[PDB]
Protein backbone atom coordinates (compact mmCIF):
# COMPACT_ATOMS: atom_id res chain seq x y z
CA UNK A 1 0.00 0.00 0.00
CA UNK A 2 0.74 3.70 -0.37
CA UNK A 3 -0.77 5.52 2.69
CA UNK A 4 0.01 9.05 1.43
CA UNK A 5 -2.24 8.29 -1.60
CA UNK A 6 -5.02 7.45 0.92
CA UNK A 7 -5.23 10.96 2.48
CA UNK A 8 -8.52 12.54 1.32
CA UNK A 9 -9.97 9.31 -0.08
CA UNK A 10 -13.33 9.88 1.68
CA UNK A 11 -16.32 12.08 0.72
CA UNK A 12 -19.65 13.10 2.33
CA UNK A 13 -22.19 9.61 6.12
CA UNK A 14 -18.58 9.18 4.84
CA UNK A 15 -17.92 7.00 1.82
CA UNK A 16 -15.12 5.53 -0.28
CA UNK A 17 -15.05 5.21 -4.12
CA UNK A 18 -14.64 1.54 -5.03
CA UNK A 19 -14.41 -0.23 -8.40
CA UNK A 20 -16.10 -3.61 -8.57
CA UNK A 21 -15.73 -6.22 -11.32
CA UNK A 22 -14.48 -6.38 -14.91
CA UNK A 23 -14.82 -3.88 -16.52
CA UNK A 24 -14.88 -1.94 -13.19
CA UNK A 25 -18.21 -0.42 -11.97
CA UNK A 26 -17.75 2.52 -9.58
CA UNK A 27 -19.67 2.58 -6.31
CA UNK A 28 -19.79 4.93 -3.33
CA UNK A 29 -19.39 2.90 -0.19
CA UNK A 30 -20.11 3.88 3.43
CA UNK A 31 -17.23 3.06 5.80
CA UNK A 32 -18.79 1.12 8.71
CA UNK A 33 -16.68 -0.03 11.64
CA UNK A 34 -19.89 -1.42 13.16
CA UNK A 35 -20.68 -4.29 10.77
CA UNK A 36 -18.69 -6.91 8.88
CA UNK A 37 -20.26 -7.37 5.40
CA UNK A 38 -19.39 -5.89 2.06
CA UNK A 39 -22.91 -5.22 0.73
CA UNK A 40 -24.00 -3.14 -2.24
CA UNK A 41 -27.17 -2.22 -4.12
CA UNK A 42 -27.82 -4.86 -6.76
CA UNK A 43 -31.02 -3.46 -8.31
CA UNK A 44 -32.34 0.06 -9.03
CA UNK A 45 -34.04 1.53 -5.92
CA UNK A 46 -35.36 4.96 -4.94
CA UNK A 47 -32.75 7.35 -3.45
CA UNK A 48 -29.68 5.92 -5.27
CA UNK A 49 -27.90 6.85 -8.56
CA UNK A 50 -26.06 3.64 -9.17
CA UNK A 51 -25.94 -0.10 -8.38
CA UNK A 52 -23.69 -3.07 -9.07
CA UNK A 53 -24.96 -5.07 -12.06
CA UNK A 54 -23.47 -8.54 -11.61
CA UNK A 55 -24.52 -9.46 -15.12
CA UNK A 56 -22.14 -6.79 -16.46
CA UNK A 57 -19.04 -8.19 -14.72
CA UNK A 58 -17.19 -11.00 -16.48
CA UNK A 59 -15.28 -11.95 -13.27
CA UNK A 60 -18.31 -12.11 -10.92
CA UNK A 61 -19.18 -15.57 -9.49
CA UNK A 62 -22.32 -16.42 -7.56
CA UNK A 63 -22.05 -18.56 -4.44
CA UNK A 64 -25.63 -19.75 -5.04
CA UNK A 65 -27.07 -18.64 -1.69
CA UNK A 66 -28.66 -15.48 -0.21
CA UNK A 67 -28.04 -13.49 2.94
CA UNK A 68 -30.48 -11.50 5.15
CA UNK A 69 -29.29 -8.95 7.70
CA UNK A 70 -31.70 -7.44 10.23
CA UNK A 71 -30.83 -4.41 12.34
CA UNK A 72 -33.06 -2.41 14.76
CA UNK A 73 -34.55 0.10 12.31
CA UNK A 74 -34.40 -2.14 9.21
CA UNK A 75 -32.87 -4.88 7.05
CA UNK A 76 -31.66 -6.10 3.63
CA UNK A 77 -31.43 -9.32 1.60
CA UNK A 78 -28.79 -9.93 -1.10
CA UNK A 79 -27.15 -12.62 -3.25
CA UNK A 80 -23.69 -13.67 -2.01
CA UNK A 81 -20.94 -13.77 -4.65
CA UNK A 82 -17.27 -12.98 -5.15
CA UNK A 83 -15.59 -10.50 -7.47
CA UNK A 84 -12.44 -8.42 -8.04
CA UNK A 85 -12.23 -5.05 -6.27
CA UNK A 86 -9.91 -2.05 -6.79
CA UNK A 87 -9.46 0.97 -4.47
CA UNK A 88 -8.15 3.67 -6.87
CA UNK A 89 -6.93 5.87 -4.05
CA UNK A 90 -4.49 3.48 -2.28
CA UNK A 91 -3.54 0.28 -4.19
CA UNK A 92 -2.63 -0.25 -7.83
CA UNK A 93 -3.80 -3.88 -7.88
CA UNK A 94 -7.21 -5.58 -7.49
CA UNK A 95 -8.32 -8.17 -4.90
CA UNK A 96 -10.73 -11.09 -4.76
CA UNK A 97 -13.45 -10.40 -2.12
CA UNK A 98 -16.86 -11.65 -1.03
CA UNK A 99 -19.80 -9.42 -1.93
CA UNK A 100 -23.52 -9.24 -1.14
CA UNK A 101 -25.70 -7.64 -3.88
CA UNK A 102 -28.94 -6.38 -2.25
CA UNK A 103 -32.16 -7.15 -4.11
CA UNK A 104 -34.52 -6.12 -1.30
CA UNK A 105 -34.19 -3.81 1.70
CA UNK A 106 -36.52 -2.60 4.44
CA UNK A 107 -35.75 0.99 5.47
CA UNK A 108 -32.08 0.93 4.43
CA UNK A 109 -31.62 3.27 1.45
CA UNK A 110 -33.27 6.36 2.98
CA UNK A 111 -33.67 9.69 1.07
CA UNK A 112 -30.65 12.04 0.81
CA UNK A 113 -27.87 9.48 1.48
CA UNK A 114 -25.05 9.46 -1.09
CA UNK A 115 -23.61 5.95 -0.65
CA UNK A 116 -24.97 2.84 -2.46
CA UNK A 117 -23.29 0.08 -0.42
CA UNK A 118 -21.68 -0.59 2.96
CA UNK A 119 -18.13 -1.68 3.85
CA UNK A 120 -18.16 -3.48 7.21
CA UNK A 121 -14.76 -3.16 8.85
CA UNK A 122 -15.44 -5.02 12.05
CA UNK A 123 -14.52 -8.59 12.99
CA UNK A 124 -15.37 -11.93 11.33
CA UNK A 125 -17.58 -12.79 14.29
CA UNK A 126 -20.26 -10.30 13.07
CA UNK A 127 -20.16 -11.47 9.44
CA UNK A 128 -23.38 -12.97 7.95
CA UNK A 129 -24.48 -15.76 7.19
CA UNK A 130 -21.54 -16.68 9.46
CA UNK A 131 -18.06 -15.82 10.47
CA UNK A 132 -16.57 -17.93 7.76
CA UNK A 133 -17.59 -15.35 5.14
CA UNK A 134 -14.19 -13.75 4.88
CA UNK A 135 -14.54 -10.01 5.62
CA UNK A 136 -13.34 -7.35 3.17
CA UNK A 137 -10.46 -6.29 5.41
CA UNK A 138 -9.33 -9.89 6.12
CA UNK A 139 -9.06 -10.35 2.32
CA UNK A 140 -7.13 -7.09 1.84
CA UNK A 141 -4.68 -7.86 4.67
CA UNK A 142 -3.85 -11.25 3.24
CA UNK A 143 -3.70 -10.26 -0.47
CA UNK A 144 -2.26 -6.73 -0.22
CA UNK A 145 0.51 -7.58 2.30
CA UNK A 146 -0.51 -4.80 4.65
CA UNK A 147 -0.43 -4.71 8.43
CA UNK A 148 -3.74 -5.65 10.23
CA UNK A 149 -4.41 -2.01 11.10
CA UNK A 150 -6.56 0.74 9.69
CA UNK A 151 -7.32 4.29 10.83
CA UNK A 152 -9.97 6.94 10.12
CA UNK A 153 -10.19 10.71 10.03
CA UNK A 154 -13.48 12.47 9.35
CA UNK A 155 -13.47 16.20 8.67
CA UNK A 156 -17.01 17.52 9.37
CA UNK A 157 -14.28 14.69 3.28
CA UNK A 158 -11.82 12.53 5.27
CA UNK A 159 -9.26 9.71 5.22
CA UNK A 160 -9.41 5.91 5.51
CA UNK A 161 -5.81 4.62 5.77
CA UNK A 162 -5.85 0.86 5.16
CA UNK A 163 -2.87 -0.91 6.68
CA UNK A 164 -1.45 1.81 8.89
CA UNK A 165 -1.28 5.26 10.47
CA UNK A 166 -0.62 8.45 8.48
CA UNK A 167 1.62 10.86 10.49
CA UNK A 168 0.26 13.95 8.66
CA UNK A 169 -3.27 13.30 10.01
CA UNK A 170 -2.55 14.11 13.66
CA UNK A 171 -0.46 16.14 16.06
CA UNK A 172 0.30 15.15 19.65
CA UNK A 173 0.37 11.58 20.94
CA UNK A 174 -1.89 8.63 20.21
CA UNK A 175 -3.63 7.13 23.27
CA UNK A 176 -4.47 3.42 23.09
CA UNK A 177 -7.30 1.71 24.89
CA UNK A 178 -7.59 -2.15 24.81
CA UNK A 179 -10.19 -3.85 22.65
CA UNK A 180 -12.27 -5.74 25.25
CA UNK A 181 -14.03 -8.10 22.82
CA UNK A 182 -13.44 -8.57 19.13
CA UNK A 183 -16.88 -8.35 17.54
CA UNK A 184 -17.79 -4.69 17.37
CA UNK A 185 -14.85 -2.51 18.37
CA UNK A 186 -15.74 -2.80 22.03
CA UNK A 187 -13.74 -0.65 24.51
CA UNK A 188 -13.92 0.13 28.25
CA UNK A 189 -15.51 3.42 29.35
CA UNK A 190 -14.58 4.37 32.92
CA UNK A 191 -16.38 7.67 33.47
CA UNK A 192 -18.37 10.40 31.80
CA UNK A 193 -17.70 14.02 32.70
CA UNK A 194 -19.77 17.15 31.90
CA UNK A 195 -18.34 20.66 32.28
CA UNK A 196 -15.72 19.03 34.49
CA UNK A 197 -18.36 17.41 36.70
CA UNK A 198 -18.48 13.63 36.74
CA UNK A 199 -21.87 11.89 36.54
CA UNK A 200 -22.47 9.71 39.58
CA UNK A 201 -23.08 6.42 37.82
CA UNK A 202 -21.56 3.03 38.53
CA UNK A 203 -19.04 2.62 35.72
CA UNK A 204 -20.81 -0.60 34.72
CA UNK A 205 -23.61 1.72 33.48
CA UNK A 206 -21.34 2.86 30.65
CA UNK A 207 -20.57 -0.65 29.42
CA UNK A 208 -23.89 -2.15 30.49
CA UNK A 209 -25.10 -3.03 27.06
CA UNK A 210 -21.62 -2.40 25.53
CA UNK A 211 -19.49 0.61 24.49
CA UNK A 212 -18.31 0.43 20.85
CA UNK A 213 -16.59 2.64 18.27
CA UNK A 214 -18.91 2.80 15.25
CA UNK A 215 -18.48 4.97 12.15
CA UNK A 216 -21.85 3.69 10.79
CA UNK A 217 -23.75 5.50 13.57
CA UNK A 218 -24.14 9.30 13.24
CA UNK A 219 -24.73 10.31 16.85
CA UNK A 220 -23.30 9.62 20.26
CA UNK A 221 -25.84 7.06 21.50
CA UNK A 222 -26.23 6.48 25.21
CA UNK A 223 -28.20 4.02 27.35
CA UNK A 224 -31.42 5.64 28.69
CA UNK A 225 -30.25 6.09 32.31
CA UNK A 226 -26.90 7.50 31.12
CA UNK A 227 -28.69 9.74 28.58
CA UNK A 228 -30.96 11.23 31.31
CA UNK A 229 -27.86 11.79 33.49
CA UNK A 230 -26.11 13.68 30.61
CA UNK A 231 -29.14 15.83 29.65
CA UNK A 232 -29.70 16.86 33.30
CA UNK A 233 -25.99 17.71 33.53
CA UNK A 234 -25.86 19.73 30.33
CA UNK A 235 -29.03 21.60 31.37
CA UNK A 236 -27.52 22.16 34.87
CA UNK A 237 -24.26 23.51 33.37
CA UNK A 238 -25.43 25.81 30.56
CA UNK A 239 -25.31 29.54 31.35
CA UNK A 240 -28.91 30.45 30.26
CA UNK A 241 -31.96 28.08 29.87
CA UNK A 242 -31.86 27.56 26.08
CA UNK A 243 -33.32 24.13 25.39
CA UNK A 244 -36.83 22.65 25.46
CA UNK A 245 -37.39 18.96 26.33
CA UNK A 246 -38.07 18.63 22.59
CA UNK A 247 -34.48 19.58 21.74
CA UNK A 248 -33.02 16.92 24.05
CA UNK A 249 -35.10 14.17 22.51
CA UNK A 250 -34.25 15.21 18.92
CA UNK A 251 -37.84 16.27 18.40
CA UNK A 252 -36.99 20.02 18.12
CA UNK A 253 -34.35 22.42 16.67
CA UNK A 254 -32.69 25.29 18.60
CA UNK A 255 -32.20 28.51 16.56
CA UNK A 256 -30.23 31.78 16.70
CA UNK A 257 -29.84 34.54 14.06
CA UNK A 258 -24.28 31.01 20.88
CA UNK A 259 -21.47 28.67 22.05
CA UNK A 260 -19.69 29.95 25.19
CA UNK A 261 -22.77 28.81 27.12
CA UNK A 262 -22.50 25.00 26.88
CA UNK A 263 -20.11 22.58 28.52
CA UNK A 264 -17.48 20.13 27.28
CA UNK A 265 -18.26 16.44 27.37
CA UNK A 266 -15.47 14.04 28.30
CA UNK A 267 -15.17 10.26 28.00
CA UNK A 268 -12.52 8.47 30.05
CA UNK A 269 -10.96 5.34 28.55
CA UNK A 270 -8.69 2.78 30.16
CA UNK A 271 -5.10 2.85 28.93
CA UNK A 272 -3.15 -0.37 28.09
CA UNK A 273 -1.72 0.04 31.59
CA UNK A 274 -4.92 -0.39 33.56
CA UNK A 275 -3.76 1.97 36.39
CA UNK A 276 -4.00 4.89 33.98
CA UNK A 277 -6.74 6.40 31.90
CA UNK A 278 -7.01 9.12 29.26
CA UNK A 279 -9.84 11.46 28.36
CA UNK A 280 -11.42 12.23 24.99
CA UNK A 281 -13.34 15.51 25.10
CA UNK A 282 -15.82 17.10 22.70
CA UNK A 283 -16.83 20.76 22.69
CA UNK A 284 -20.38 22.00 22.08
CA UNK A 285 -19.52 22.57 18.39
CA UNK A 286 -19.42 18.74 17.95
CA UNK A 287 -22.63 17.93 19.90
CA UNK A 288 -24.68 21.05 19.02
CA UNK A 289 -25.03 20.22 15.38
CA UNK A 290 -25.81 22.79 12.64
CA UNK A 291 -28.57 21.78 10.20
CA UNK A 292 -31.36 32.08 11.68
CA UNK A 293 -29.16 29.00 12.08
CA UNK A 294 -30.81 25.93 13.64
CA UNK A 295 -29.17 23.04 15.53
CA UNK A 296 -29.96 19.46 16.47
CA UNK A 297 -28.68 17.77 19.66
CA UNK A 298 -25.82 15.39 18.77
CA UNK A 299 -26.70 12.73 21.31
CA UNK A 300 -29.61 10.27 21.44
CA UNK A 301 -30.82 7.39 23.69
CA UNK A 302 -30.03 3.74 23.06
CA UNK A 303 -31.50 0.53 24.37
CA UNK A 304 -28.78 -1.80 22.99
CA UNK A 305 -25.35 -0.09 23.31
CA UNK A 306 -23.24 2.94 24.12
CA UNK A 307 -22.20 4.00 20.64
CA UNK A 308 -19.28 6.30 19.99
CA UNK A 309 -20.55 7.39 16.55
CA UNK A 310 -19.49 10.23 14.19
CA UNK A 311 -20.53 13.01 16.64
CA UNK A 312 -17.39 11.93 18.49
CA UNK A 313 -15.21 10.40 15.75
CA UNK A 314 -15.28 13.76 13.93
CA UNK A 315 -12.89 15.16 16.56
CA UNK A 316 -10.23 12.47 16.45
CA UNK A 317 -7.91 10.41 14.32
CA UNK A 318 -9.13 6.91 15.23
CA UNK A 319 -6.76 3.94 14.84
CA UNK A 320 -8.36 0.50 14.80
CA UNK A 321 -5.32 -1.63 15.64
CA UNK A 322 -6.62 -5.19 15.25
CA UNK A 323 -3.07 -6.58 15.22
CA UNK A 324 -2.42 -5.36 18.80
CA UNK A 325 -6.01 -5.52 20.01
CA UNK A 326 -6.35 -1.80 20.75
CA UNK A 327 -8.17 1.29 19.47
CA UNK A 328 -6.03 4.44 19.33
CA UNK A 329 -7.02 8.10 19.54
CA UNK A 330 -5.32 11.38 18.69
CA UNK A 331 -6.78 14.92 18.25
CA UNK A 332 -7.69 15.75 14.58
CA UNK A 333 -5.99 18.97 13.41
CA UNK A 334 -8.82 19.27 10.81
CA UNK A 335 -11.46 19.30 13.60
CA UNK A 336 -11.59 23.12 13.97
CA UNK A 337 -14.27 25.76 13.45
CA UNK A 338 -13.56 29.54 13.55
CA UNK A 339 -9.97 29.08 14.75
CA UNK A 340 -10.72 26.79 17.70
CA UNK A 341 -10.26 23.07 18.28
CA UNK A 342 -13.62 21.36 18.69
CA UNK A 343 -12.01 18.44 20.52
CA UNK A 344 -9.17 17.62 22.94
CA UNK A 345 -7.42 14.59 24.32
CA UNK A 346 -5.52 14.48 27.62
CA UNK A 347 -3.92 12.10 30.08
CA UNK A 348 -2.87 10.34 32.15
CA UNK A 349 -5.32 10.14 35.05
CA UNK A 350 -5.26 7.55 37.82
CA UNK A 351 -7.86 4.72 37.78
CA UNK A 352 -7.22 3.93 41.47
CA UNK A 353 -10.79 5.00 42.45
CA UNK A 354 -12.64 3.01 39.74
CA UNK A 355 -13.41 -0.75 39.52
CA UNK A 356 -10.47 -2.52 37.79
CA UNK A 357 -12.90 -3.92 35.23
CA UNK A 358 -16.11 -1.93 34.32
CA UNK A 359 -17.54 -4.46 31.86
CA UNK A 360 -20.21 -6.83 33.26
Amino acid at each position, epitope marked *: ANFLAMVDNLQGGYYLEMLIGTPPQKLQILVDTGSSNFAVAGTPHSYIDTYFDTERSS*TY*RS*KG*FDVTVKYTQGSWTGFVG*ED*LVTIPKGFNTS*F*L*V*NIATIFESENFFLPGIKWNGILGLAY*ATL*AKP*S*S*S*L*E*TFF*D*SLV*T*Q*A*NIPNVFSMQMCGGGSLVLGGIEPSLYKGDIWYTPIKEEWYYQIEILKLEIGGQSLNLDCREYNADKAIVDSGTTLLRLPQKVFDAVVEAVARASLIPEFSDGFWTGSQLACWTPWSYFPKISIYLRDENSSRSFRITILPQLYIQPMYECYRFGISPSTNALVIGATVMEGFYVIFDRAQKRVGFAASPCAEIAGAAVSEISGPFSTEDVASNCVP
Partner: nanobody
Framework: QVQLQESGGGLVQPGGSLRLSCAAS????????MTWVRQAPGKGREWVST????????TYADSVKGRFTISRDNARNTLYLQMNSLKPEDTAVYYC?????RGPGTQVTVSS
Protein backbone atom coordinates in the same frame (compact mmCIF):
# COMPACT_ATOMS: atom_id res chain seq x y z
CA GLN B 1 -13.06 -25.39 12.62
CA VAL B 2 -12.33 -23.33 10.60
CA GLN B 3 -9.51 -25.89 10.93
CA LEU B 4 -6.72 -25.85 8.28
CA GLN B 5 -3.78 -28.24 7.90
CA GLU B 6 -0.97 -27.78 5.32
CA SER B 7 1.38 -30.54 4.09
CA GLY B 8 3.67 -31.36 1.18
CA GLY B 9 6.72 -29.27 2.10
CA GLY B 10 10.34 -30.51 2.04
CA LEU B 11 13.98 -29.82 1.20
CA VAL B 12 14.46 -29.44 -2.50
CA GLN B 13 17.15 -28.38 -4.94
CA PRO B 14 17.00 -25.24 -7.09
CA GLY B 15 14.87 -25.99 -10.15
CA GLY B 16 12.87 -28.60 -8.21
CA SER B 17 9.18 -28.82 -7.47
CA LEU B 18 6.63 -29.66 -4.75
CA ARG B 19 2.90 -30.09 -4.44
CA LEU B 20 1.37 -28.53 -1.31
CA SER B 21 -2.02 -29.54 0.15
CA CYS B 22 -4.23 -27.90 2.69
CA ALA B 23 -6.92 -30.05 4.24
CA ALA B 24 -9.84 -27.98 5.58
CA SER B 25 -12.74 -28.76 8.00
CA UNK B 26 -15.33 -27.11 10.23
CA UNK B 27 -16.74 -24.81 7.54
CA UNK B 28 -18.27 -25.11 4.01
CA UNK B 29 -15.11 -25.37 1.96
CA UNK B 30 -16.93 -25.20 -1.42
CA UNK B 31 -18.02 -21.70 -0.39
CA UNK B 32 -14.75 -20.14 0.66
CA UNK B 33 -12.15 -18.01 -1.07
CA MET B 34 -8.82 -19.73 -0.22
CA THR B 35 -5.37 -18.15 -0.13
CA TRP B 36 -1.74 -19.24 0.14
CA VAL B 37 0.74 -17.02 1.88
CA ARG B 38 4.39 -17.46 2.86
CA GLN B 39 6.78 -16.19 5.48
CA ALA B 40 10.52 -16.73 5.92
CA PRO B 41 12.28 -15.89 9.22
CA GLY B 42 13.35 -12.23 9.38
CA LYS B 43 11.01 -11.26 6.49
CA GLY B 44 7.49 -9.92 6.18
CA ARG B 45 4.60 -12.12 5.25
CA GLU B 46 4.18 -12.41 1.45
CA TRP B 47 0.97 -13.26 -0.41
CA VAL B 48 1.34 -16.09 -2.87
CA SER B 49 -1.98 -16.90 -4.52
CA THR B 50 -5.77 -16.67 -4.06
CA UNK B 51 -8.55 -18.82 -5.54
CA UNK B 52 -12.35 -18.25 -5.64
CA UNK B 53 -14.68 -20.82 -4.18
CA UNK B 54 -15.58 -22.39 -7.58
CA UNK B 55 -11.96 -22.44 -8.67
CA UNK B 56 -12.35 -20.49 -11.95
CA UNK B 57 -10.90 -17.23 -10.59
CA UNK B 58 -7.19 -17.39 -9.62
CA THR B 59 -4.67 -14.62 -8.89
CA TYR B 60 -0.89 -14.75 -8.32
CA ALA B 61 1.92 -12.74 -6.79
CA ASP B 62 4.23 -11.42 -9.55
CA SER B 63 7.16 -13.23 -7.92
CA VAL B 64 5.45 -16.66 -8.50
CA LYS B 65 3.38 -16.10 -11.66
CA GLY B 66 4.09 -18.90 -14.20
CA ARG B 67 5.90 -21.17 -11.74
CA PHE B 68 3.06 -21.92 -9.21
CA THR B 69 -0.54 -23.01 -9.90
CA ILE B 70 -3.25 -22.93 -7.23
CA SER B 71 -6.20 -25.30 -7.47
CA ARG B 72 -8.76 -26.97 -5.25
CA ASP B 73 -10.97 -30.04 -4.94
CA ASN B 74 -14.20 -28.98 -3.24
CA ALA B 75 -15.45 -32.61 -2.94
CA ARG B 76 -12.29 -33.44 -1.02
CA ASN B 77 -12.13 -30.19 0.98
CA THR B 78 -8.52 -29.67 -0.17
CA LEU B 79 -6.54 -26.69 -1.48
CA TYR B 80 -3.30 -27.28 -3.52
CA LEU B 81 -0.31 -25.37 -4.75
CA GLN B 82 1.81 -26.87 -7.49
CA MET B 83 5.28 -25.33 -7.23
CA ASN B 84 7.74 -25.62 -10.16
CA SER B 85 11.14 -24.07 -11.00
CA LEU B 86 11.80 -23.53 -7.32
CA LYS B 87 14.56 -21.08 -6.39
CA PRO B 88 16.31 -20.27 -3.06
CA GLU B 89 14.09 -17.13 -2.52
CA ASP B 90 11.02 -19.40 -2.42
CA THR B 91 12.19 -20.70 1.01
CA ALA B 92 9.48 -20.15 3.69
CA VAL B 93 6.73 -21.58 5.78
CA TYR B 94 3.78 -21.74 3.40
CA TYR B 95 0.40 -21.20 5.09
CA CYS B 96 -3.09 -21.59 3.74
CA UNK B 97 -5.66 -19.07 5.02
CA UNK B 98 -9.40 -18.39 4.97
CA UNK B 99 -11.65 -15.90 6.86
CA UNK B 100 -8.77 -14.66 9.04
CA UNK B 101 -7.71 -18.15 10.13
CA ARG B 102 -4.53 -19.97 9.10
CA GLY B 103 -3.12 -23.51 9.44
CA PRO B 104 0.23 -24.12 11.21
CA GLY B 105 1.99 -24.07 7.83
CA THR B 106 4.41 -26.30 5.90
CA GLN B 107 8.20 -25.73 5.47
CA VAL B 108 9.62 -25.26 2.02
CA THR B 109 13.46 -25.13 1.72
CA VAL B 110 15.20 -24.61 -1.64
CA SER B 111 18.96 -25.21 -1.53
CA SER B 112 22.06 -26.93 -2.94
Amino acid sequence: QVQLQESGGGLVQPGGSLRLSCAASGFTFSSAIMTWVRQAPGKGREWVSTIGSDGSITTYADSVKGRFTISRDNARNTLYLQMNSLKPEDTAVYYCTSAGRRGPGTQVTVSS
